[PDB]
């Protein structure tokens, strides 16, 4: 229909990709997936509470932190309620449901709901107020809980549109006819590898022929694998060699319909590990890319129990030898009693053997131990990586994810969305899981949209698959969100244009012009006049709605990339703050890497949360919105650590100790408040000391480090260092705020938090190892070597004794004392040659 044809154009503009495009496919896999996803989409729309979906209560069932329980002069805590300048503070119990406070209103002074002042965050549902995320945020910040007596938002605004083995198999060895290669404009050979979970089952090469625009072979490449032995999820990896790899392409030997791939194929190749090297998608640039023409016509002993128990224990990056694999496979029923052995056991399977594969499925039936076990995110995710191409293995991991509460989904989301790059087929248990969790909760859904949209907008390798998952979501989120994302995209597209034009205007030559700041205000006034939405939603903080720009407050930052500095008025008039919303728009670096580091930082804070530690990290908002471009959060009242040095000193290099504490006393209204800033610095520094070290992003210029007037420290621009000696940034100016020029009471405390922190991350070695190895593979293609991945092993000191490693970190701190300003001076010198 005419109104159905227009709905798809609204989807296309939102997605950033035309999903109804068949000009780059050799099968109907994406269409089979659009169609396949219709049922889990309609099933989650129909299953969700309309009243609770509309209000998206953000809650946790995690035990209330020990540090935060102490914040209350226990048992009865007070919160402020508003309703037309009628504001009364009410003492409420932490175990009180919102309704208990709602019916306490009739007694104090239903048809109305408790909403937070300034943001779209309702305190609703049958949950104790201690379990609401906003309340916990306010407690820790030393901030007053302010709510307004709003009315419940209409679930009718969330209105949804109505509309929607293998048998070619025989004993014969598998063969593929390589006809030749063609590019529009040494010697060249083609490599044919049968891959399953990165493990090469069989490898065959061609006779090298002279390098020409049309190379022909007409050769049949018979493999050692029988047609019957081919496992579903296996890839035919075609690679072109000089000995250097030039081009590569993949083709899924078994269909999404379980059919062996028979026929003539002209595959457009990708030009030169990386997750992009795994893609089933062909190159869209059919005009410039090389193509490949192909044809397809077809009781246990103690000494040994000690050995596999030692294997079970070794980290996710320790390789298994044939000895280990054979042992694991033979004593597989024992290995099944230990859930932390499943990644090792499933990597001991001979996937190129139907017999072994069937036995693995027989072994999978007796999942009793696996299912009854407590969900290990580090173990679950380990089975979703590149080493696992089996659908049934991947599903048992996706099964454990079904038990994550919306709080923990939102937490591992980016990495679960990235884990989709490891799936053999477009339709998968994981893709579906992500769809259900998103369609169910607006916060999971809002983030899902941008997370998918970032990859769609800058990867020709996975945009097709990701675009399909997005259309499926967009069709079930509702008209409210469908309108809400529309105004978010309109604002981003306009601003991104402004960002690139102003980057072009500025020379790149160190300093910024008066006419550049004038042209910005002039271009912002043209956007503000008309076309730009009256109000929109902040993509990194969906709670906050941004109204109209503060054109006078907007400027162009004095950096080599020339980013935008934008201030926005809050759309809410209940904003009990004057404060504008500050967003930085920047073209230059891949903010997909900042996004990743920022997410692990959020994980480390949660790891510390369980050990009752708050290390005051500041993982600010950041969304990659397109090719080498995106938006960033402005952390209010913060300044560059180098800019504080550049103030007193005025120029590069001298660097005085006291300067830091000088600015701290300068920017603290009371010495009684300065004592709290000293306290906030001592562990906000400790947090970033540990974190950056573990992730190997500790060697950074003091320009890339910031501090608030309240003394909270934070590292910035992570993609800058990732697009390329000391352990971390601990400098004499920081050591001066502690009282060390030697030991002091604060520096003693710094090390104590550092040791308690480095050891707390170590109790989660395997989680951090998979998150890191996955992050490098799916996000940063520069650092995708065996050696780059293995950094987290040495950093976390795997296998080392708890006391022996506690010394390794205290020794690392001493390398900072050894080298006071040695490389901070070298960095300052380097960034000016
Ligand atoms: C590339 O810059 C960043 O990543 C970044 C992150 C946070 C941040 N917060 C800032 N705050 C202020 C007040 O300058 S500037 C800034 C910059």
Helix axes 745-762, 671-695, angle to 10 degrees: 40
Please work out whether the CB of residue 716 comes within 6 Å of at least one atom of ligand 1. yes
Q: Which of 620, 743, 606, 604 is nearest to 686 (CA)?
A: 604
What are the residues whose beta carbons fall under 8 Å from the beta carbon of 45, sequence distance 6 or more?
Answer: 160, 439, 476
Residue in the block written with tokens 């020709």: 460
Report the DSSP beta bridge partners of residue 421.
none
Q: What is the Å distance from ligand 1's center to 604 Cα?
A: 21
Annotated binding site: 582-591, 617-625, 714-722
What are the residues whose beta carbons fall under 8 Å from the beta carbon of 827, sequence distance 6 or more?
Answer: 700, 701, 702
Q: How many CB atoms lie within 10 A of CB 346?
A: 25
Q: Which of 152, 136, 171, 141 is nearest to 63 (CA)?
A: 136
CB 144 within 8 A of CB 254: no
Alpha-carbon distance 168 to 10, whole Å?
42
Alpha-carbon distance 418 to 774, whole Å?
8
- Strands 77-82, 146-150: parallel, antiparallel or unpaired by DSSP? parallel
Q: What is the Å distance from ligand 1's center to 152 Cα?
A: 36
Helix axes 38-47, 29-36, angle to 10 degrees: 20
Q: Would you state the structure tokens that stand for residue 618, as one six-digit string?
A: 């500041």
Phi, psi of 803 (to 5 degrees): -75, -35
Phi, psi of 738 (to 5 degrees): -85, -40
Q: Would you state the structure tokens that stand for residue 382, as one six-digit string?
A: 């380990």
State the sign of the Cα–Cα–Cα–Cα dihedral 432, 433, 436, 439.
negative
Please work out whether the CB of residue 717 comes within 6 Å of at least one atom of ligand 1. yes
CB 439 within 8 A of CB 41: yes
DSSP state for residue 59 in the 8-state scheme: B
CB 195 within 8 A of CB 235: yes
Q: Would you state the structure tokens that stand for residue 243, as one six-digit string?
A: 């000995």
Alpha-carbon distance 815 to 794, whole Å?
16
Report the DSSP beta bridge partners of residue 584.
565, 632
Annotated binding site for ATP: 582-591, 617-625, 714-722
- Give the neighbor-by-neighbor strand order of the sheet with 705-708: 638-640, 705-708, 713-715
| Ligand 1: residue whose CA is nearest its atom 7 | 634
Q: Can you tell me whether residue 487 is helix, strand or coil? A: helix
Alpha-carbon distance 266 to 26, whole Å?
9
CB 216 within 8 A of CB 190: no
Report the DSSP beta bridge partners of residue 59.
132
Please work out whether the CB of residue 138 comes within 6 Å of at least one atom of ligand 1. no
Residue in the block written with tokens 């938006």: 631
Q: How many helices (H) and strands (E) does the chain have?
A: 34, 24
| Ligand 1: residue whose CA is nearest its atom 6 | 716
Residue in the block written with tokens 């919303």: 581
- Buried/exposed 297-324: b ≥16 CB within 10 Å, e otherwise: ebeeeeeeeebbeebbeeebbeebeeeb
Helix (H) or strand (E) holding 3: helix 2-15
Ligand 1 pocket test, candidate residues 541, 584, 701, 703, most atoms within 8 A of CB? 584
CA angle 361, 367, 370 (to 5 degrees): 130
Q: What is the Å distance from ligand 1's center to 557 Cα?
A: 10
Alpha-carbon distance 21 to 558, whole Å?
43
Q: How many CB atoms lie within 10 A of CB 763?
A: 11
Residue in the block written with tokens 């670096």: 589
State the sign of the Cα–Cα–Cα–Cα dihedral 3, 5, 6, 7.
positive
Q: How many CB atoms lie within 10 A of CB 637?
A: 11
State the sign of the Cα–Cα–Cα–Cα dihedral 708, 714, 719, 720.
positive
Q: Which of 147, 143, 127, 115 is nearest to 60 (CA)?
A: 127
Q: Would you state the structure tokens that stand for residue 521, as one six-digit string?
A: 């205000």
Please work out whether the CB of residue 759 comes within 6 Å of at least one atom of ligand 1. no
* Closest-lying ligand 1 atom to the alpha carbon of residue 636: 13
State the sign of the Cα–Cα–Cα–Cα dihedral 597, 598, 599, 605.
positive
Q: What is the Å distance from ligand 1's center to 635 Cα?
A: 6
Q: Would you state the structure tokens that stand for residue 197, as one six-digit string?
A: 């979970």
| Ligand 1: residue whose CA is nearest its atom 16 | 634
Alpha helices in 86-132 (DSSP H): 98-102, 104-108
Q: What is the Å distance from ligand 1's center to 651 Cα?
A: 21
Q: Which of 396, 385, 450 is nearest to 424 (CA)?
A: 385
Q: Which domains does the chain have, with CATH numbers?
A: 1-163 (3.10.20.90), 169-296 (2.60.40.150), 297-478 (1.25.40.70), 479-636 (3.30.1010.10), 637-825 (1.10.1070.11)
Alpha-carbon distance 760 to 599, whole Å?
18
Q: Would you state the structure tokens that stand for residue 792, as one six-digit string?
A: 């987290």
| Ligand 1: residue whose CA is nearest its atom 1 | 717
Question: HSE of 202 in the Cβ direction (CA atoms, 13 Å)?
Answer: 19
Alpha-carbon distance 183 to 716, whole Å?
43
Q: What is the Å distance from ligand 1's center to 623 Cα?
A: 14
Question: DSSP letters of 478-497?
Answer: -HHHHHHHHHHHHHHHHHHH
Experiment used for this model: X-ray
What are the residues whose beta carbons fall under 8 Å from the beta carbon of 680, sequence distance 6 or more?
Answer: 616, 708, 710, 711, 712
Alpha-carbon distance 256 to 233, whole Å?
9
DSSP state for residue 619 in the 8-state scheme: -
């Amino acid at each position: 229909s005419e109104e159905s044809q227009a709905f798809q154009r609204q989807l296309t503009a939102l997605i950033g990709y035309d999903v109804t495009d068949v000009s780059n496919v050799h099968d109907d896999e994406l269409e089979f997936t659009r169609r396949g996803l219709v049922t889990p989409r309609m099933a989650e729309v129909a299953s969700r509470d309309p009243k609770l979906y509309a209000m998206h209560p953000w809650v946790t069932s995690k035990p209330l932190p020990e540090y935060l329980w102490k914040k209350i002069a226990n048992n009865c805590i007070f919160i402020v309620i508003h309703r037309s300048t009628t504001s009364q503070t009410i003492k409420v119990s932490p175990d009180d449901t919102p309704g208990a406070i709602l019916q306490s209103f009739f007694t104090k002074m239903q048809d109305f709901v408790l909403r937070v002042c300034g943001r779209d965050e309702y305190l609703v549902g049958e949950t104790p107020i201690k379990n609401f995320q906003w309340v916990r945020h306010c407690l820790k910040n030393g901030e007053e809980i302010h709510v307004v007596l709003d009315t419940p938002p209409d679930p009718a605004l969330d209105e949804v549109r109505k509309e929607e083995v293998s048998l070619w198999d025989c004993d014969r060895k598998f063969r593929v006819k390589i006809r030749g290669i063609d590019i529009p404009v040494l010697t060249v050979f083609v490599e044919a590898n049968i891959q399953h979970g990165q493990q090469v089952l069989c490898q065959r090469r061609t006779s090298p022929k002279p390098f020409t625009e049309e190379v022909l072979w007409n050769v049949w490449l018979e493999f050692s694998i029988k047609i019957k032995d081919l496992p579903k999820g296996a890839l035919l990896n075609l690679q072109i060699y000089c000995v250097r790899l030039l081009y590569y392409v993949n083709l899924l030997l078994i269909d999404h319909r379980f059919l062996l791939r028979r026929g003539e194929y002209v595959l457009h190749m990708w030009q030169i590990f990386n997750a992009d090297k795994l893609t089933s998608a062909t190159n869209p640039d059919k005009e410039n890319s090389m193509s490949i023409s192909i044809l397809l016509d077809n009781e246990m002993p103690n000494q040994l129990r000690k050995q596999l128990e030692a294997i079970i224990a070794t980290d996710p990056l320790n390789p298994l030898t044939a000895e280990d694999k054979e042992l694991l496979w033979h004593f597989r029923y024992e290995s099944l009693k230990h859930p932390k052995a499943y990644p090792k056991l499933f990597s001991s399977v001979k996937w190129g053997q139907q017999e072994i594969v069937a036995k693995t499925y027989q072994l999978l039936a007796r999942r009793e131990v696996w299912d009854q076990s407590a969900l290990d995110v580090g173990l679950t995710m380990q089975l979703l990586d590149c080493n696992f191409s089996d659908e049934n293995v991947r599903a048992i991991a996706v099964q454990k994810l079904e038990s994550l509460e919306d709080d923990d989904v939102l937490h591992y989301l980016l990495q679960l969305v990235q884990a989709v790059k490891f799936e053999p087929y477009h339709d998968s248990a994981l893709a579906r899981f992500l769809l259900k969790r998103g369609l169910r909760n607006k916060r999971i859904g809002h983030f899902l949209f941008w997370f998918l949209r970032s990859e769609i907008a800058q990867s020709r390798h996975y945009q097709q698959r990701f675009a399909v998952i997005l259309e499926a979501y967009l069709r079930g989120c509702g008209t409210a969100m469908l309108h809400d994302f529309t105004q978010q995209v309109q604002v981003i597209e306009m601003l991104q244009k402004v960002t690139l034009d102003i980057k072009s205007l500025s020379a790149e030559k160190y300093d910024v012009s008066s006419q550049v700041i004038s042209q910005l205000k002039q271009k912002l006034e043209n956007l503000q006049n008309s076309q730009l939405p009256e109000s929109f939603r902040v993509p990194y903080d969906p709670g906050l709605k941004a109204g109209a720009l503060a054109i006078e407050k907007c400027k162009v930052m004095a950096s080599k990339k020339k980013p935008l500095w934008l201030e926005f008025k809050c759309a809410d008039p209940t904003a009990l703050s004057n404060e504008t919303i500050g967003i930085i728009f920047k073209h230059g670096d891949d903010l997909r890497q900042d996004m990743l580091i920022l997410q692990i930082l959020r994980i480390m804070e949660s790891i510390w949360e369980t050990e009752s530690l708050d290390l005051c990290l500041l993982p600010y908002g950041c969304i990659s919105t397109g090719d080498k471009i995106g938006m960033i959060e402005i952390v209010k009242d913060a300044t560059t650590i180098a800019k504080i040095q550049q103030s007193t000193v005025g120029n590069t290099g001298a660097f005085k100790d006291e300067v830091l504490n000088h600015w701290l006393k300068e920017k603290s209204p009371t010495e009684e408040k300065f004592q709290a800033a000293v306290e906030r610095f001592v562990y906000s520094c400790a947090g970033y000391c540990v974190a950056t070290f573990v992730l190997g992003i500790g060697d950074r210029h003091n320009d890339n480090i910031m501090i608030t007037e309240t003394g909270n420290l934070f590292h910035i621009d992570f993609g800058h260092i990732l697009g390329n000696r000391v352990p971390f940034v601990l400098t004499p100016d920081f050591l001066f705020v502690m009282g060390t020029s030697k030991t002091s009471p604060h520096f003693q405390k710094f090390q104590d938090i550092c040791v308690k922190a480095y050891l707390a991350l170590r109790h989660h070695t395997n989680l951090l190892i998979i998150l890191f190895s996955m992050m490098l593979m799916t996000g940063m293609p520069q650092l995708t070597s065996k050696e780059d991945i293995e950094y987290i092993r040495d950093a976390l000191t795997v296998g080392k004794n708890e006391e022996d490693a506690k010394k390794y970190f205290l020794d690392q701190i001493e390398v900072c004392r050894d080298k006071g300003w040695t490389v901070q001076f070298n960095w300052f010198l380097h960034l000016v040659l």
